[model samples]
Target: MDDDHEQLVEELEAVEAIYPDLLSKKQEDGSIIVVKVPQHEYMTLQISFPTHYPSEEAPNVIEVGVCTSLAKRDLYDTKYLQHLFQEVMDSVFHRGSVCLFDFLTELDGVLYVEPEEETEPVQQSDIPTDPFEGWTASDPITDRGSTFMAFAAHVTSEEQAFAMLDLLKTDSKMRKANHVMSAWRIKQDGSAATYQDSDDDGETAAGSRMLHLITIMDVWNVIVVVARWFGGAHIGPDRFKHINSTAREAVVRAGFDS
Candidate 1:
């Protein structure tokens, strides 16, 4: 029991001390330690150290154990576990010297992300994709070679507001546009509180300004989207003015301002 062995003993003590209830085994030798990922209590990594670990070799992640409902989805598979910890293990070992704690702490950030549903329920709605059908489009405002336009639609729920925005992106022109900022205020049925949100879409604060405009005008059940096509020049702060103005024009034309 020299440098490497002593370091292993100290590391085990520190890990057990920090995670009082996280260790699943009580082994005096530093052969194996099952430590749960911090903040994610449902996941645990079965780790083991070789005889010369920390001096000549790196520790190994033997197995991954997860008892959550996601375990049924093959998240318990060894292939996924290897993919998740491969980089982390390589990085820690390359840095050298008692890297178990580093590996464990780093693992706190390496849990795999759950894949998104292939078909979200939000896309199953009967809402039409064409904004020109019932939505109002503002006249395009051209300034400094940049063109700005807006579309406003009456929506009863957050889902519908987002649905209109998502469907609007299906247009050939809208999909190719530089930026599409949006804001909406929905007073859900039987609820006094208004639910509102905005997306800047890389325009930077343009959506909140439109949301501000809608709120100040006391407009509800409406979604406003401003699409900007960048020319060769920058319009500075004036772009926001046009964004709000075009958004206001569409809301007014949609008859939501009344």
Candidate 2:
């Protein structure tokens, strides 16, 4: 075997020494492997590899799909767990080096935990009833089976902003959306106040995310809203990443990328 293959054997030996119960296997040609590592009592990983790994490329992760419960399935986030795990491996990978040990340990460090409990949804009675209209919006950005739509509109005054919000609320569709997080800022030439506010629609801390987006965009006299629709799979914390992803697209798509 060459240096790269020889290096893999050494790493595999160390893994055997360290993880005695680890499920490790090698292909007859010595070009690939599959192994499973259990983290905590519930989370496990089945990582795979192709030839020239470490020397040339990173490996992939599998589940062995040894699931015990729905909770177990969701807990590992198996759907995108592999994707995130691969990202972790690539981040730590170095040329001609076997990094599986580091990759295994880091996966636990990054994703083996409880997702922060989601907060209660916002109450409709608490939502403002306004008649403000005429906001520019991006077509819904869809990802991972979820959907987000963003709306932005310029308002000369709080009255204008409020009215447009009220009008948006009046949308038969908006009324039915899962979450309609919003943030707005009013810079005044003359005004009752320099107005800024947000609503999370019960999507805890989501309003802050939307606010951050508009702030970074450096928008003024504008209200921005992002609506999210669920696709039945729990995305864990990555949902926030998707939320921001779609919201930014919304801002740019609505012609505010500049």
Candidate 3:
């Protein structure tokens, strides 16, 4: 119907209003729009939509283009991109409503996540031959089957802080964890200098987040480590909630939150 064509044009005008150069080509049956990968101009997505979209069918992602450097990356394979595109499309499709804007917004959110890849665990050959002691652990917080537990230790120096970490590392159960994110802030005895640092341990910015908790709480002379056992499903941003909760609890339980 003429209304359907008019509807398509109206949606096109809206999209053009937002993304000036997104519309690459216009045809009688369909049109092409480009999505620049989030934070990376080297990659792009070319999506094609029929005139009957949002009524008779949903749009299709026709192609993904990456620069030469990304071509050799195994994670950016064809099957992965196909699945990514289809997943985004499926989430925003509706019976008879224009979904181009919604689709692009949802895709932008999803594209920000990188493909999962395995990370090699750090190795420590000089393990202290001591028992795991003096570390106070918070109640386990489990969400979507993923478990997060925080351990806190009162320490006065970097050596004492690491000794506590090494003690945790000596434990067979903790050594098997997916990530041991940690942070510490210590005030030197009889000196004005303060020592503070964090380690992500392959959990990305988790360690720094823990350090932020320490700074915000003003808990000094203490180190906190949050051990996470990855569940089969992804927990998304909510994982940070559990991380901070357990860390806060551990600090309080250890009497470091003074």
Quote each prediction's TM-score.
0.41, 0.39, 0.41
Off by over 4 Å in 1: 1-131, 192-194, 231-249
Candidate 1 residues 96-163, lDDT tens each?
34544545544543442223545223222111112243345653555554556666777766665555
lDDT of 2 by residue, 1-258 (tens): 678667766666676677766555666633455555465434455666655465455565644344455766655556566666566565445323454544554455454332557642322111111112144554345455455666666666777667556645544345456777677777876656787565676675767887776777776766777677654333334544655666565556444564
On the 0 to 100 scale, the lDDT of residue 100 in model 1 is 49
Better candidate number, 2 or 3, judged by lDDT: 3
RMSD of each: 20.7, 17.3, 19.2
Model 3: per-residue Cα lDDT over 1-258, one tens digit each? 587767776767776677665445545533666655555555667777765465455677777777664644665654567666766565445423454544564455455433366542322111111112245555345455456667676776766666546645544335556677777777866997776555676676677787777778777887777777654443444545654565556567675765
lDDT of each: 0.59, 0.56, 0.58
Residue 161 CA displacement from its true place in model 3, Å: 1.6
- True-vs-predicted CA distance for residue 61, candidate 3, Å: 62
Q: After superposing candidate 3, which stretches have Cα over 4 Å from the reference?
A: 1-132, 231-249
